[PDB]
Design a binder for this molecule. Structure first.
Ligand code: NA
Ligand code: NA
Ligand code: NA
Ligand code: NA
Ligand code: NA
Ligand code: NA
Ligand code: NA
Ligand code: NA
Lengths: 335, 335, 335, 335
């Protein structure tokens, strides 16, 4: 048995990486790759837009308006789409009996104001918000193993929570000093699109979304702790490195922080813990891992987490959740 | 006395570099910087779009529809605009008594088919074509010293002709084998614009305009010799490196090629001739020079020419011609 | 049954990519990874130097002086070493009964002067030169299927010959005009090493080895045709793009060139032929393919070939040959 | 009158930028450029190593052992050298009557343990430590206007203190929460040198000097406040961007922070204050400025400061101090 898999928004950068993994996956194959109804890319091959897939996957991109053209007989739907589209589509696919893995921010947080403030829309499916599993794979339980709607976390929130969650859960941080998360992403995180801001000559190094980015409250809500989160656009296509600075609870030691991380991740295959030193970004790009190292001096902690923004930050985590949902090896198709 | 200077298309990448030099120039200053009538940037400061100019030049960008708003009392007009715009505007500014330095391809070659084939328009000003000085500064005579319309050469044609012209003029090449010019440009050569092709993640290394680029016939017409010309888009913002491979006329030697170049360029300040070895691109970026080195083995020549595509390839050559036209030191404002 | 596999020079950049593939390969595993006798990296883990391998392969790097420490029971030896080392070691491993896949230039060409001129040493194993299979995988016959010494071609020669060989073999080029091969490589092609020339700030774009590079005569000897070959160091870590300009034999057409390439490569899985247009480098980096596109106008041909310099240009071709030698699927471990 | 100017360590990256400015400066010219006694670059031209200077400055690099070969008649000495060399040389040049501008860390902080802990040497000139002016140009008074020894601040400390000093001096920060300074530098900050760590393929994005970097205590001592300082090596040659996160003193507002910065910098020409938004690194590279923007939400401040690491972070600040010391326009030669 193989899972029929629909990939919506397949022509974007995250979408291309989903096509790669699902094609490769021994237990899944693709029914269709869709674009929007009036997409200029309708009828082009996936490999025309993403030539790394030439000779590997060459499915045409089909324009989708009514989802009934694409829902019957589909086991898994990946929504590699922005929130408005995912808000509209996900309920329809669930009703058609599909298990939906939404990469958008649309179902990530069970809260109305969250959507009004940071996404600028009123959320129309409160029941789904309650039902959605937050697909932070290393930490999800069996709301996931048996959810039919999985909200895959954002790229920056993924590294951030992998670094911070075990420490906060062990009460190792003095949260009266909000953790400061500074992160730099490659430009693929902006999406495939012609805009001035992601135009080649416009990229160097700059912070953005200062005190405004929608990933900040996602990280704060899910960790149960206020944080500073400042993203930066760097002049490379792929990867996120996060440098995270905290005040430890008084008396907390290096060995104590190491114990908490060793216990969280030693049997988690997609998290690579550095015993000493801190990871370099190149060492994870094109791989599905999150790499984590840290240092302690006195009452301060600096923890550093890297990932490929399109892999553990998007497509690989999505597929990793599908593996958990459907009972396959957790890393199946990823490594 | 100072020259009143209008810069049309000031908000583009070449335009910003013209603003820098003209501001700096002791004998010129700026009356206005214009954008198109319905430009989204109308009313923004030049330094909002190009923050390297913050605190240096902060003139607002004015939308221009009727040129009579901007022509009276203007000594010099730089058209940092594409050919259609330059075709329309340049005749009007000349009639208003301005000396026009057009950066577009619109007046570069005295030939009708040239425009139909490579620019896809029928040229409406044959007399101007006859009158335009081709602003390849090291080689222009007194059609320039006294022209009122200067067509500034394209960026790739500039390095190409500086390398090849003295050799062809000394009959040192066997032109039965067309020179092969392979060049790589930084992405600023594509212009300021949101398109997929110059989007950050879409750039790596690729040839383009293969047997179609409009700079090929400009180079061939002006050199009086058929050439292969293949440009490549590289993943850096600024600079052009050209590697040019020729068959020498039988018996032609290294010393003979060196003599021809030494004689062409020894007293030309913006051309830096390498006695031995070949230039690296970083050594000219942000400078107004063209750097040239070469090697000979047997009957083959390899000559290598670099420039900053926006400086000697665009703005600096434009200003260099203005210096010649108006009698200032050739390098005034450039270095 | 699995092949015991020794990787000599494992700590270099090509060596790391061999470790990755051989680890992954279902029919091979690694006995040891070696460094030189007094290497500063002796005793470090492979994944300390190449952290992309963390949690995947963590074999220590062992210093090797006498090969008898490492030869018994070894089926396959990869020499990821420079020519002098490979010249000394390969004969010893062959005598111990190992099948040797040398990545160096040491056994690539059956000719003495070749070694004196371009490698600056007199070759001491003429019989081995006669015996070595040249591992250009798409073109090798059964000198390979049954060779015990395979000389893996250089990175630039690989793309060059894949583009040119089928055309020359079909007499489609006028070789009175030598093909001009201009290529740009990422800096990994320089090897892992601290030198000024591959130091970060020293890299931009520059030709090198002008009329001197050792890959030129390898390409010319094996193609049976004189060529110009000029490599360039570009400011990126991985990939080679070659732009190759030829004069066609009189009367030769686009369709005729396409037929020759379609017939050469249609059933060759690691060569991806572009029907129209020319490949972009990013689309092959991290993949084992060589991508080829071309254009014809009049009597000129421009053919463009890309590869990952460490994969099809080094490690993947090495492993591909091993697959052919030992009877595994040609792409086994590569894709 | 012109100042005779000696540049020691001229062949390094900062040294090359000093040569550029001093050459250009109307009131200074160069007596000699020196390298170490057994330097491999002795006798090479400055422009051989730094070809951007070809045809502009072509002084040979002279090996210096005894300083009496180079001290008589010299008005100004720039030491573009590391601390041990500067510790040894600066006292000798001062004794010869030269005004010394040391770019090393050797005289930056009046404290012995500082040198033992972070520089691993016992400082032999306590009187000089007392006499040295700290050349943070916007803040220096008349210990500078009349010092004969100027310790030019480190590159990262410069942006950091320009951002933080006016805020701390106005008591606007709650220093019970140490400011967190995360910074990314281009690889030129590592110096000209062949090492693995600054080799092209070894650079991507990585923190370094975590809780160990010598710039941390320099920043903390001079600000009179404990800080976290974590530098990162990024994959570009030039520039530093610092993102600095603070807890404000209770009640402190955006307008209050803006007032303090406007008052500090409005008449300081090399500091470009952003009224709204935060600077992008490309907009300062190759320029002598420090660009500063900031945002406030609630009780947190994020202030962002950029500079060219070799210009305002090194050579331009050095020259700026010389201008102040000798009474020239502050920006003379810089812009
Ligand atoms: Na599959
Ligand atoms: Na783990
Ligand atoms: Na001016
Ligand atoms: Na010259
Ligand atoms: Na294996
Ligand atoms: Na094929
Ligand atoms: Na001077
Ligand atoms: Na200011």
């Amino acid at each position: 048995a193989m899972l029929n898999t629909l990939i919506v928004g397949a022509s974007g950068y995250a979408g291309a990486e989903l096509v790669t993994y699902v094609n490769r996956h021994p237990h899944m194959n693709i029914t269709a790759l869709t674009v929007s109804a009036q997409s200029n890319d309708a009828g082009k091959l996936i490999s025309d837009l993403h030539p790394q897939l030439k000779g590997i996957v060459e499915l045409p991109l089909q324009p989708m308006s009514d989802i009934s053209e694409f829902s019957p007989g589909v086991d898994v739907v990946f929504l590699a789409t922005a929130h408005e589209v995912s808000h509209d589509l996900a309920p329809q696919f669930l009703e058609a009996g599909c298990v939906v893995f939404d990469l958008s921010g649309a179902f990530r947080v069970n809260d109305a104001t969250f959507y009004e403030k940071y996404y600028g829309f009123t959320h129309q499916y409160p029941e789904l918000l309650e039902q959605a599993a937050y697909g932070l794979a290393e930490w999800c339980g069996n709301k996931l193993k048996e959810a039919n709607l999985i909200a895959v976390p954002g790229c920056y929130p993924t590294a951030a929570q992998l670094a911070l969650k075990p420490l906060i859960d062990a009460d190792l941080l003095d949260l009266n000093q909000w953790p400061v998360i500074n992160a730099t992403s490659g430009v693929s995180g902006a999406g495939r699109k012609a805009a001035i801001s992601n135009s080649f000559c416009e990229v160097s190094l700059q912070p953005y979304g200062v005190f405004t980015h929608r990933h900040q409250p996602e990280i704060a809500t899910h960790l149960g702790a206020d944080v500073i989160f400042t993203p930066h656009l760097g002049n490379f296509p792929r990867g996120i490195l996060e440098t995270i600075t905290c005040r430890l609870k008084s008396g907390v030691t290096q060995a104590q922080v190491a114990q908490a991380l060793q216990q969280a991740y030693a049997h988690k295959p997609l998290v690579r813990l550095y015993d000493k030193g801190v990871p370099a970004l190149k060492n994870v790009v094109g791989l599905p891992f999150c790499d984590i190292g840290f240092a302690v001096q006195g009452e301060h902690l600096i923890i550093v987490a890297t990932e490929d923004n399109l892999l553990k930050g998007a497509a690989a985590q999505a597929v990793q959740c599908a593996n958990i949902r459907f009972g396959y090896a957790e890393t199946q198709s990823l490594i």
